[PDB]
Curated annotation (Swiss-Prot), chain B:
The modification N6-acetyllysine is found at residue 93. Keywords: Acetylation, Ribonucleoprotein, Ribosomal protein, RNA-binding, rRNA-binding. GO terms for biological process: cytoplasmic translation. Binds together with bS18 to 16S ribosomal RNA. 5 different forms of the protein, varying only in the number of C-terminal glutamate residues, were isolated. The sequence shown is form bS6-6, which is the longest. The first two Glu are encoded by the rpsF gene, the other Glu are added post-translationally by the RimK enzyme. The chain holds residues 1 to 100 of 135 of the full protein. Part of the 30S ribosomal subunit. Interacts weakly with uL2 in one of the 3.5 A resolved structures. One of its GO terms (cellular component) is cytosol. The lineage of its organism: Bacteria, Pseudomonadati, Pseudomonadota, Gammaproteobacteria, Enterobacterales. One of its GO terms (molecular function) is mRNA 5'-UTR binding. Belongs to the bacterial ribosomal protein bS6 family. The keyword Amino-acid biosynthesis does not apply. This is Small ribosomal subunit protein bS6. It comes from Escherichia coli (strain K12). The keyword rRNA-binding applies.
Amino acid sequence: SLSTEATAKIVSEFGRDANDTGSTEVQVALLTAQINHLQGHFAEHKKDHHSRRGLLRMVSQRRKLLDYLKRKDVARYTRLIERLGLRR
Amino acid sequence: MRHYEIVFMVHPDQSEQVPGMIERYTAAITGAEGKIHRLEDWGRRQLAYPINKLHKAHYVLMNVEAPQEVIDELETTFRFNDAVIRSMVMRTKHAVTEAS
Amino acid sequence: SMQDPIADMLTRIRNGQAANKAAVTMPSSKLKVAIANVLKEEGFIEDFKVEGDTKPELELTLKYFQGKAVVESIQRVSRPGLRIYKRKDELPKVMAGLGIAVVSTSKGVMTDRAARQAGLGGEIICYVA
Amino acid sequence: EIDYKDIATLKNYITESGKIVPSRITGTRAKYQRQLARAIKRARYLSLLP
RNA sequence: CUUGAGUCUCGUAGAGGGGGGUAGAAUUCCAGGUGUAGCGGUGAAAUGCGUAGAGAUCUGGAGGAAUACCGGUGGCGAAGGCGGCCCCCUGGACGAAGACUGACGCUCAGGUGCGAAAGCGUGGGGAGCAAACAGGAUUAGAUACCCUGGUAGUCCACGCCGUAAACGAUGUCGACUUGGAGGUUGUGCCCUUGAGGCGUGGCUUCCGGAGCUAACGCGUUAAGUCGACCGCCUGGGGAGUAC
């Protein structure tokens, strides 16, 4: 649902260059933008459950990517979890 | 911002205020950053079933391109107005402007 | 394959033999090539050949005496879930010596006869027969 | 390719009472069937047909 | 490292979901006339309506339920399950090339969440129906069956329940192994006519080979050949019962 322009902005603003779509920082930033917006969605309706499932996939996959960063490179991970505001 | 297709019937009883209503709504949309890509009228055709105790209706379809939001107040007015009993608003899935 | 690529290669061999296929292929590893060496030097296959640089592919060539495949069984023994290691005095005879066990010794991957000769055991890869 | 507004190719897909003809006797490819039926339903509720 | 997994770019199909209004068919009474000997039903009456105007007609209303055709050998969804039209929000899937990451994976006890129907609780709603209950006759006696009304419920909001033959009675994931007949949805080449002719994917229905199976059968969507992890079984009854 998240617009193409927003994905381009995020890929730029967390990517190591332009069109590095697939690095963990890029992946996590897209997932966190989507989490925030959907949490906007489900605030108003709490009784959508088939869509909320896709949101649990987003959250779970984002935890898995963040755990991969922490294991691989701690420095980029710690820069990210606040440079994007995470592990609150 | 993607295509719509407004269709609304103005009854012969309601045919009194056709231009006023059409132009007021077109002005509202244009001020709402919405530009008409096409417009046509299908006259006053015949109604298969006597809807609302009547057999005639002047079918005007206006089909503008509009943002997400500016359409809600239009249907709000349609519900609050007796000019048209049913104005149904449409989508595109694509880019079409020509009429037929 | 996903977790045991060596049972993948044996499954391919026995499935292609029961399918009367002339050659099977699979993504190569260096231990796949080692076991393939053992087999083709024991006369269980004709040949193999690894092509590709970033994606090598191991090209086993199956072997039929007439219309019957040379391998009757080929079973994975040590798997992820049971690793099997034998001391050289307890290396297994497979079908009373008529079939091999390929073991992984610390001097490489050899047959069972070769290992009990050179006096060193190791991890039992499979039973061929 | 085909939509609701052209009432021409709808009367052939309908009866007098307004029942959509099954594709079992027309030949429709089962994608044009869904779109076609949506067209008749829109038109009925837009009141070209009962 | 790039083959698994993912991110990206672009399109396709869909009863996937939550909302928001939306319209008719049918539905009963009233609002009136039109009409007077009927309405009603079973094993049979009868019970209940009606001559106080009863049904039906058209007329408007009221209000709720549900969306006949399409409709399917269809589809989507993890499963439960999802079907009028239209908008808003939303989920997932798939296909084509390309880019990016760089094993980021699979499975999962515990845990967490969803979960038909009935039911419960709290407020409403109640057009039809319908356990209970209320008339008649039963039948060997009738608290048979039945028909006549009929309340909970059914519907909505929130909370609880957490169960089904919740079933493909078939855990999840990956790989490999002959065919034939279809359906649905993409897409490439060439007919640059719409299909087309030839590919090529995804889903899906049915035959059947080897194999497997006790047999029935399954059979590339395996119940074949394997690998990873989980759940489970251990004679029938007692009993999914007691504590």
